[PDB]
Structures are given as structure tokens and as C-alpha cells.
């Protein structure tokens, strides 16, 4: 009843996700419409059952015109349920998720898989990044700022941590990283300095 | 069955079965009517029209006023009609307090656009009626700021 096909045949994915965000926020027991829109972007980037968001909404507006793919629609639904409860359990907050989704998880990195799959590695890496976000403290948010671009530099990093610069120099020479392009690099420096 | 006299904007023609008479609004020289003192922006807001020809009972004159300017204000006021012409303004009432806009409101006082008096089927049913036609009066009320 609420929405129709008029903006369903459009090409503006972000507009469609933004306008659908309240409905998913309700059906998914989710906090804010912005997180609904972000997780919509994420599920689109997954493409669970060979679907996009516009297709998702067109099929929903269809009155169960798919005999078998309605189960695929509800599989998409359970998939966003899983990602949403991942967010709830890991307690990720607004800005970190926004950066990760707007960067297509490029600021994370993964193994033999772009962005992020739905396996254990993604969950573990996101959890690590989140404890590190929390332990950054007050300036850590603007740290994410310099993380959104590739201006994340060594001396600023060490100064935020409160640690020595030369430690970080040795860590980048040992870990082989010349620039902290992705959180894989950051995490490797983290593990080397932790050792 | 066809005539043409006049220049662009100020013309009279008989197209198809329809007599057209276009008047260039800028051609009327409303600027010179009153001094530039105590007035900066002038614009048209009302037009009534009179057709005092030989008309008895039961004869129904049909006229159309159309404006074809560049300033395009939404429909409802871009054209008016004439049936009686006895100080006919094109409405059941002459109210200046209308919540809505009067037809032909906001026009530039000497816009490059033109206004057309059009008589349908004068070939034809209004041929006799417009044969007896003498002339037309245009009472234009306009405001000056």
C-alpha cells in the first residue's frame, strides 16, 4: 500500500534505499533509518539471491508473482536479519558502519574476497576493528576521518596511540607495509607491535 | 476566404475558418501614458472587452483572447473567452479580491509578447455576425509600482 513502482524503475539506488529505510527499520527491529539504509547498501553489495534493491522492491510489490523466488526474498530478509543482529551483537555504531559501507569495506580488506563475505573472517575482522575504534578514544573519530582517505599517516597514528614513533617505523619495516591502505595493514602493524 | 495585413505582432489574418487579430503588447506604449516619476515597475492585471456590433436576441458572439508570451504563468489564466461582449470580462463575477489569480495577471506592461482576438467559424456561422461587426474596445486595467 505505502510504496509503488513509480520510483522502483529508477536508477537512483541510494534514494530507493533511503526511502525504504523506515520500513526495514521497523520490520528488522532496527535503531535508525540511516543504519537501515547502510545495511541496505551492504546487502545490495552482497547480492544474496542474484538480486538488487530495485528488484527487491519490485518483487515485493508483486503479489507473490514468483512461486519459488519468494523464498529467495525471505532469504534476503533473513540475510539482512543476520547482518543486523551482527551489528547489534558486535555493537558497532553509526559512523564506523557508515565509513565501512560507503567505502565498500575497502578500508577493511579481506582474504581472497573483496569487500566482505558472510563468513567468520569478516566477523572477526570487524570485531577487531571495533575494539580498536573504541580504544582510540575521543580523537579516534577523526582518525576514522583520516582513514576514510589514504591520509592515515604513521606519526599521527603513533601519537594517537600514545606510543613511540620509532616503534611504528620498525613495525612498518617488519610488516612490509609502506602505507596503511587498508585495515589489513593496520591490523598487521597492530599485531606486530602487540608482540 | 483568406486575408493578411500587418506586421509581426500587429497583424490580422483569416487562417482556416478562424479570424485572428494579434496586437503586440509592447506596441501599445503604456510607458508614455504616465511619467516615470513615482513608478518603477508596471504590469497588466485586468482586461475587459466590448463588442458593440449589430446583435439582437439569440445571437451568441464567440471570441477568444490568447496571450503567447515568454513569461509562462500556469494555466487557468493564459486565455479568456467572450460570449456577450457587453462589457464582458469573461467571468460570472468581477471580483478583485479573488483568492486565485485573475486571467492575464502578472504580464509585463510592455512585454514583447502579443495578445490575439480570435473569432471562430466566421466563414460560416459568424460570417454574417462579423460582417455587421464595427470594432472592439479593450479596457485594460493595470497597476504601477
Amino acid at each position: 500500500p505505502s510504496i509503488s513502482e513509480d520510483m522502483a524503475q529508477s536508477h537512483n539506488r541510494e534514494l530507493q534505499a533511503e526511502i525504504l529505510a523506515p520500513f526495514i527499520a521497523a520490520t528488522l527491529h532496527l535503531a535508525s533509518p540511516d543504519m537501515a539504509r547502510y545495511i541496505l547498501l551492504w546487502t545490495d553489495n552482497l547480492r544474496p539471491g542474484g538480486l538488487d534493491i530495485a528488484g527487491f522492491m519490485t518483487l515485493v510489490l508483486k503479489e507473490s508473482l514468483n512461486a519459488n523466488e519468494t523464498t529467495q526474498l525471505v532469504q534476503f530478509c533473513h540475510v539482512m536479519a543476520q547482518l543486523s543482529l551482527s551489528v547489534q551483537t558486535l555493537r558497532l555504531s553509526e559512523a564506523e558502519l557508515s565509513v565501512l559501507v560507503i567505502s565498500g569495506f575497502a578500508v577493511l580488506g579481506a582474504k581472497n574476497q573483496p569487500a566482505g563475505q558472510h563468513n567468520i573472517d569478516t566477523l572477526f575482522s570487524l570485531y577487531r576493528f571495533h575494539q580498536w575504534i573504541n580504544g582510540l578514544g575521543n580523537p579516534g573519530s577523526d582518525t576514522l576521518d583520516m582513514l576514510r582517505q589514504q591520509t592515515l599517516t604513521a606519526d599521527r597514528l603513533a601519537s594517537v596511540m600514545g606510543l613511540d614513533i620509532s616503534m611504528v617505523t620498525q613495525a612498518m619495516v617488519s610488516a612490509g607495509v609502506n602505507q596503511l591502505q587498508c585495515w589489513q595493514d593496520i591490523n598487521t602493524v597492530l599485531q606486530w607491535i602487540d608482540v | 476566404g483568406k486575408g493578411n495585413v500587418g506586421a509581426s505582432g500587429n497583424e490580422l489574418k483569416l487562417s482556416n475558418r478562424q479570424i485572428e487579430a494579434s496586437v503586440r503588447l509592447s506596441d501599445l506604449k503604456i510607458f508614455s501614458d504616465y511619467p516615470e516619476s513615482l513608478g518603477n515597475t508596471r504590469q497588466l492585471k485586468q482586461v475587459s472587452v466590448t463588442l458593440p456590433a449589430l446583435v439582437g436576441p439569440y445571437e451568441d458572439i464567440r471570441a477568444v483572447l490568447n496571450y503567447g508570451g515568454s513569461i509562462v504563468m500556469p494555466r487557468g489564466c493564459s486565455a479568456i473567452a467572450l460570449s456577450h461582449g457587453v462589457n464582458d470580462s469573461g467571468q460570472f463575477m468581477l471580483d478583485f479580491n479573488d483568492s486565485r489569480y485573475l486571467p492575464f495577471e502578472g504580464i509585463s506592461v510592455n512585454d514583447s509578447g502579443s495578445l490575439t482576438l480570435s473569432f471562430p467559424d466566421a466563414t460560416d456561422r459568424q460570417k454574417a455576425l462579423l460582417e455587421s461587426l464595427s470594432d472592439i474596445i479593450l479596457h485594460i486595467r493595470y497597476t504601477i509600482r
Binding site: 500500500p1 | 451568441d60 500556469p74 494555466r75 487557468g76 473567452a81 460570449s83 467571468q91 486565485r100
Partner: protein, 98 residues
């Protein structure tokens, strides 16, 4: 009861709009405002959105239609009929005689 009554009024409003615009396709009352799972609450503001949509449609598609008046004479009309052209007054007086 109050919701049923305002629902009937809003339906009547939609029909009035439909007649005014002489288009019988535009619909805004799509039902479901009495959401049963939630005691049928919070339908007033959904109806308010319906009314806002009504007002938007009415104003945006508004068109001050051009007005024309036509005078018709029954004597001339009947005297000038394509299939049965006849004197109207004479037939009147005759039908009066019988």
C-alpha cells in the same frame, strides 16, 4: 466508531475530489489504516497524509477552466433538426387543441 466515521468522511472527500476533477482513477484511501495487530491505532495521521496528498493533487493539477455561455432557442433548435425539422410553436398550439 469515530475512526469508522472519519473513514467514511475521507472516502466521501475522495469521491468529491474525483467528481471535481472528473477523473475516476486517482485513489488515496487504500485501506489498512485500522492496523489490527496494533489495536487499530494511529490511523488519524495516516489519514492526515491522505488529506495532504489530496490537497497536493488538487492544487498541482489545478486549472482555472475557461468559461463560455451559450444561448439556445428551443423553437430554432427544433425547427432546425436534421431528421425531424418542424415548427415548435405550431405543434404546441395543435397539441393544445387536442
Amino acid at each position: 466508531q469515530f475512526f469508522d466515521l472519519t473513514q467514511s468522511f475521507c472516502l466521501m472527500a475522495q469521491e468529491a475530489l474525483r467528481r471535481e476533477l472528473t477523473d475516476n482513477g486517482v485513489t488515496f484511501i487504500r485501506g489498512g489504516a485500522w492496523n489490527g495487530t496494533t489495536a487499530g491505532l494511529m490511523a488519524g495521521e495516516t489519514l492526515l497524509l491522505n488529506l495532504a496528498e489530496m490537497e497536493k493533487v488538487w492544487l498541482e493539477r489545478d486549472e482555472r477552466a475557461l468559461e463560455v455561455t451559450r444561448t439556445v432557442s428551443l423553437a430554432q433548435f427544433y425547427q432546425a433538426l436534421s431528421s425531424d425539422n418542424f415548427n415548435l410553436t405550431e405543434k404546441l398550439t395543435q397539441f393544445l387543441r387536442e
